[PDB]
Amino acid sequence: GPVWRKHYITYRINNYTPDMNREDVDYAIRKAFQVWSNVTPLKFSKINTGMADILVVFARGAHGDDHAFDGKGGILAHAFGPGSGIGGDAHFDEDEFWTTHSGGTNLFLTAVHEIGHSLGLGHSSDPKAVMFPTYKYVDINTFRLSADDIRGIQSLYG
Ligand SMILES: COc1ccc(S(=O)(=O)N[C@H](C)C(=O)O)cc1
Ligand SMILES: [Ca+2]
Ligand SMILES: [Ca+2]
Ligand SMILES: [Ca+2]
Ligand SMILES: [Zn+2]
Ligand SMILES: [Zn+2]
């Protein structure tokens, strides 16, 4: 399936959840990309204008694609695989309550998983992996990709 065929990848935050401090959204998204560039040759850069490879969006309900959100709970976010246009883009459900911590739904953890999809990774059946199909909070100050997540990404890049 698709992968990015270039090493410098850009992203852009289309808009910001009111759930968080802005700088906290910026840092959570940045840390999430870093998790992946730590184990691949990819470099990620935030641009503020123009067309990014990966558009980061907060939206609720029906939001102009075929992956309508469902209110609070259920689906937290979704992302498109590598490709032009909406390819790569990662959408976060505004009906969730985004946080830097264990309360609500953690944006950083969610963003890690969604960026995995943006890079072309699918799901793992291993509950330790961030790409397990269903969300499970783990302490983010000590967060590490599982060996399973590492083999998956390294089967696509590097
Ligand atoms: C932190 O990882 C997760 C973030 C969101 C979800 S999810 O929101 O339950 N499912 C979407 C469609 C997905 O697999 O991307 C499941 C796991
Ligand atoms: Ca939801
Ligand atoms: Ca895109
Ligand atoms: Ca919200
Ligand atoms: Zn969407
Ligand atoms: Zn997923």
Swiss-Prot record:
Residues that bind Ca(2+) 3: 70-71, 73, 75, 93, 96
Residues annotated as catalytic: 114
Domains (record comment): The conserved cysteine present in the cysteine-switch motif binds the catalytic zinc ion, thus inhibiting the enzyme. The dissociation of the cysteine from the zinc ion upon the activation-peptide release activates the enzyme.
UniProt record similarity statement: Belongs to the peptidase M10A family.
Compartments where located: Secreted, Extracellular space, Extracellular matrix
Residues holding Zn(2+) 1: 63, 65, 78, 91
Record-given protein name: Macrophage metalloelastase
Organism, scientific name: Homo sapiens (Human)
Shown part of the complete sequence: 106 to 263 of 470
Binding-site residues, Ca(2+) 2: 53, 85, 87, 89
Function: May be involved in tissue injury and remodeling. Has significant elastolytic activity. Can accept large and small amino acids at the P1' site, but has a preference for leucine. Aromatic or hydrophobic residues are preferred at the P1 site, with small hydrophobic residues (preferably alanine) occupying P3.
Binding-site list for Ca(2+) 1: 19, 94, 96
